[PDB]
Coordinates of C-alpha atoms in Angstrom, one line a residue:
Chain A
X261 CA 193.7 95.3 156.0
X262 CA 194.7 92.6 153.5
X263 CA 197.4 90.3 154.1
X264 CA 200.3 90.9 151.2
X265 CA 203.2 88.5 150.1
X266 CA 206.8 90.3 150.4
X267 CA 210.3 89.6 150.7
X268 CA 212.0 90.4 153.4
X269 CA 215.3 92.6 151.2
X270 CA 217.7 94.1 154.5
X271 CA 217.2 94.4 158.0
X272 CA 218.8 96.5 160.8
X273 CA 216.9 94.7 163.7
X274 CA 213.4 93.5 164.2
X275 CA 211.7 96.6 164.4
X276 CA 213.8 98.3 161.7
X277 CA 213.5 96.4 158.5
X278 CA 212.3 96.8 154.8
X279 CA 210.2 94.8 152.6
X280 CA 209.4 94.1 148.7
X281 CA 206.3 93.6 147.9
X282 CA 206.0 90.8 145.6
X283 CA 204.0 91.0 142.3
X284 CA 204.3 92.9 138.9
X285 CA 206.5 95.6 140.8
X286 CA 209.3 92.8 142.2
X287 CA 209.2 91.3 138.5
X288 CA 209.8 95.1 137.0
X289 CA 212.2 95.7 140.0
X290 CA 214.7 92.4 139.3
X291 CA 214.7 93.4 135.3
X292 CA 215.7 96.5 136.4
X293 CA 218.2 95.4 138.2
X294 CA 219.7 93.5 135.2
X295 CA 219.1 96.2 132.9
X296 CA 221.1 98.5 135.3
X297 CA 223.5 96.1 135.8
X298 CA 224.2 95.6 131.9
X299 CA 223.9 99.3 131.1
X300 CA 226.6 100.5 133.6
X301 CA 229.0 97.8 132.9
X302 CA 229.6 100.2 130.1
X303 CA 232.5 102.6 130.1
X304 CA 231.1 104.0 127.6
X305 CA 227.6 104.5 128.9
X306 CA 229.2 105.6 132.1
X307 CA 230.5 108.3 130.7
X308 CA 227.1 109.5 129.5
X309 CA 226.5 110.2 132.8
X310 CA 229.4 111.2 135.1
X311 CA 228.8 112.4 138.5
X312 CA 229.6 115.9 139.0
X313 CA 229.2 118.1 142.5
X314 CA 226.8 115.3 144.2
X315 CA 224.6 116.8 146.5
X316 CA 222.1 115.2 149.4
X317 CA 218.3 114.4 147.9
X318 CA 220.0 113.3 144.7
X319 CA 218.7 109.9 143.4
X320 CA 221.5 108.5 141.7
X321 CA 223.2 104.4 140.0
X322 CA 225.7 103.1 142.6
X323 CA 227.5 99.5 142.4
X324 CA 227.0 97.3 145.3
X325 CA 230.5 96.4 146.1
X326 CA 228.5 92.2 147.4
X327 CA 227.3 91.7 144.0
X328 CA 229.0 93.8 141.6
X329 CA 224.8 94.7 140.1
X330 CA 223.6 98.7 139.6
X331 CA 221.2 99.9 141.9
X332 CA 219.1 103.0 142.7
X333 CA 220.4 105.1 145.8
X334 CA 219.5 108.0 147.6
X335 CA 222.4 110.2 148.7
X336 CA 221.9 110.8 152.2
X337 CA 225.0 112.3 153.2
X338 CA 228.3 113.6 151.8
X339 CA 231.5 114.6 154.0
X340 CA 235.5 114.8 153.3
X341 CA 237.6 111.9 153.0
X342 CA 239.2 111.6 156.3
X343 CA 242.6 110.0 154.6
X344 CA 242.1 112.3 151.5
X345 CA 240.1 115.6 151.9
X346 CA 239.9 116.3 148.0
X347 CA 237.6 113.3 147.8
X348 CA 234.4 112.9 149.6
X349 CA 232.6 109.9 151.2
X350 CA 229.0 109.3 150.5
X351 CA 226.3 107.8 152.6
X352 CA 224.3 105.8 150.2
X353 CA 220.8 104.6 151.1
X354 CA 219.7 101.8 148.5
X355 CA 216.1 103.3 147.4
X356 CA 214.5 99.8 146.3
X357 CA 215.9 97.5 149.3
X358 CA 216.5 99.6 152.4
X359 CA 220.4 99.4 153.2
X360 CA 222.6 101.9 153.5
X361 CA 226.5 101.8 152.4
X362 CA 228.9 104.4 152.8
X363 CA 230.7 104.5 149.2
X364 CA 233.4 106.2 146.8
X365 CA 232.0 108.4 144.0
X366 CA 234.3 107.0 142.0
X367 CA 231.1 103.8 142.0
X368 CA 228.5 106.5 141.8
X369 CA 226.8 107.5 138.3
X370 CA 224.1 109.9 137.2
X371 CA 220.7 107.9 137.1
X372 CA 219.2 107.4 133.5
X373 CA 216.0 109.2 133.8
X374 CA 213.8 106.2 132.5
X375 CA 215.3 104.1 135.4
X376 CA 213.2 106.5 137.8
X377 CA 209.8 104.9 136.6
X378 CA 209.8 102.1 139.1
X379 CA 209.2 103.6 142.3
X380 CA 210.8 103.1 145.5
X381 CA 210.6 99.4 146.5
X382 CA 211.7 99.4 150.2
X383 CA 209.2 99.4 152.6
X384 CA 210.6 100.4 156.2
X385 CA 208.5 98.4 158.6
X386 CA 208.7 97.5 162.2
X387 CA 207.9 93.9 163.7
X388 CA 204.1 94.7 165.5
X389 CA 203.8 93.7 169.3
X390 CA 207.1 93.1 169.8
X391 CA 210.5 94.8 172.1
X392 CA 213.7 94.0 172.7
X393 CA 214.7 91.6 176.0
X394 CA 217.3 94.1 177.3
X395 CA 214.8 97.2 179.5
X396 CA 218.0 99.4 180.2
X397 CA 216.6 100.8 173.3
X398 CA 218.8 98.9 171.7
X399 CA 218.3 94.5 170.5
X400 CA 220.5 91.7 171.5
X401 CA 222.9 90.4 168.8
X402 CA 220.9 86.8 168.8
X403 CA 217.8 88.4 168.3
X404 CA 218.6 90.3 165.1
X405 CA 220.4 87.1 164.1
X406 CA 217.3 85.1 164.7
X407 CA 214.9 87.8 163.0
X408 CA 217.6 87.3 160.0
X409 CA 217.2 83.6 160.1
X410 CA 213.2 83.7 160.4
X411 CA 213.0 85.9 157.9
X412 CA 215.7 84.2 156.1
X413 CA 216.9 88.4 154.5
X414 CA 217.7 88.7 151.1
X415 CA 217.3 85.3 150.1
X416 CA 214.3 85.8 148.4
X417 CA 212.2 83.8 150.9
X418 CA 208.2 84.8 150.2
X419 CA 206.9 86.0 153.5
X420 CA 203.2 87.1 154.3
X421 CA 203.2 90.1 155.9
X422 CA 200.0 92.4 157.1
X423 CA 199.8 96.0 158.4
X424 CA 198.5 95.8 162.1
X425 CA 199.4 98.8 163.5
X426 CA 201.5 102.2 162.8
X427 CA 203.7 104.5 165.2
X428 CA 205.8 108.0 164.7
X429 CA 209.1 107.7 163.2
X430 CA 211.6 108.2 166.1
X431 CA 213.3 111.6 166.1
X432 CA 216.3 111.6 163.5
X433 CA 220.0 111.3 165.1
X434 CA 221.8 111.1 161.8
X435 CA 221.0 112.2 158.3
X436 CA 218.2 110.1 157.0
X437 CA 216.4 109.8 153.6
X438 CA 213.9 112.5 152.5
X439 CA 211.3 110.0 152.3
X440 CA 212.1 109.4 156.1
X441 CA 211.5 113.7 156.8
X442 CA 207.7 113.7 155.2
X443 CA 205.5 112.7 158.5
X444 CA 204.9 109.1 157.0
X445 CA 203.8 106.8 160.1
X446 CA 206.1 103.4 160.2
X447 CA 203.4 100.5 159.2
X448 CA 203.9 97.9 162.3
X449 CA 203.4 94.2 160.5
X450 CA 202.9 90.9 161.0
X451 CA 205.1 88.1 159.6
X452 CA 205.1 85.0 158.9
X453 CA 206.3 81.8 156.8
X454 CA 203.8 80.1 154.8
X455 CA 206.9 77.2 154.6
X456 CA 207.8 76.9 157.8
X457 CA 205.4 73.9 159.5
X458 CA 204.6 76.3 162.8
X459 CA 201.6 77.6 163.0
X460 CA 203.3 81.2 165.2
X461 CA 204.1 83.7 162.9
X462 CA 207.6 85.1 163.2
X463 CA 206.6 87.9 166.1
X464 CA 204.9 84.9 168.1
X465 CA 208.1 82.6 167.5
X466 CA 210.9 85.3 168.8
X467 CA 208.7 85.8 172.0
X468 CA 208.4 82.2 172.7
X469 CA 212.0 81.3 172.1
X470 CA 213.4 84.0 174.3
X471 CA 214.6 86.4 171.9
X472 CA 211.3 89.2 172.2
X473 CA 209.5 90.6 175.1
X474 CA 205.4 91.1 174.3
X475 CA 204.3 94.6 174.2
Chain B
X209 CA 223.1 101.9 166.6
X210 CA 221.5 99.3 164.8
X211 CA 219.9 101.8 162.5
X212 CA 221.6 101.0 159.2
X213 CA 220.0 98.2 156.7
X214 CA 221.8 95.7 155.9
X215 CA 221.8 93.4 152.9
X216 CA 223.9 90.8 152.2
X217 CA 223.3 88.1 149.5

């Protein structure tokens, strides 16, 4: 299949990361952002939309506490403050970049229903032909440092990725997004930077570094 | 267990 330009928007190691693909859709995606942001700066427009009896499934506005900007989340999980049981702690998957935070309702708001438009922008994809250097599965610290670097994550570093290969999402061991429960195969890519002067994409430059075993 | 996203700008 065709080769696509993306950005590389959060990563949990090399072959658990999301992408943005990068056209009309990223353009809509960042005014969205700043539309978000501005509109639920608004007490006011808050309160058009309070959060009441959250529930998991429910696509919702959440502040990222590293930018202070309003963005599209995916409750994944709700359970008792530990500290403070009349509260609750929510698990927070970020719908259009791929991290998850645990959060505060108290930063959640209902979603205005023409901010569900967009869809989804996170891609979960796996780094093709690829596994970690420790066999005893788990990656190295280093080597989800240097996938970070390569990929140079959230900095809005255009990457060319292409769809090589797909596997069966692993069995779930915590609550995961509904998106995550519908059978979808994980899309295996390729990577690499048209910037950077090497001529091995990202895959080929982590196994000849040291930080990836070939499959 | 290296599972989560992160994103940090």
């Amino acid at each position: 299949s065709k080769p696509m330009e993306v950005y590389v928007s959060a990563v949990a190691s090399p072959t658990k990361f999301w992408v943005q693909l990068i056209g009309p859709q990223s353009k809509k995606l960042a005014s969205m952002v700043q539309e978000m942001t501005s509109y639920y700066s608004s007490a006011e427009n808050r309160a058009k939309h309070v959060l009441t009896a959250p529930y998991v499934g429910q696509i919702v506005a959440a502040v990222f506490k590293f930018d202070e900007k309003w963005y599209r989340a995916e409750i994944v999980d709700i359970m008792p403050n530990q500290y403070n049981p009349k509260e609750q702690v929510i698990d927070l998957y970020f719908v259009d970049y791929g991290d998850s935070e645990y959060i505060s309702p108290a930063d959640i708001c209902e979603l205005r229903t023409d901010f569900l438009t967009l869809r989804f922008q996170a891609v979960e994809c796996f780094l093709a032909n690829v596994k970690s250097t420790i066999q005893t599965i788990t990656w190295p610290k280093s080597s989800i440092a240097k996938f970070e670097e390569l990929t140079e994550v959230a900095h809005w570093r255009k990457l060319i990725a292409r769809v090589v290969t797909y596997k069966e999402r692993p069995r779930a061991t915590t609550a995961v997004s509904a998106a995550a429960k519908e059978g979808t195969p994980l899309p295996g890519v390729e990577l690499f930077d048209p910037a950077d002067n090497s001529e091995l994409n990202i895959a080929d430059l982590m196994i000849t570094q040291g930080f990836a075993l070939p499959l | 267990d290296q599972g989560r996203g992160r994103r940090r700008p």
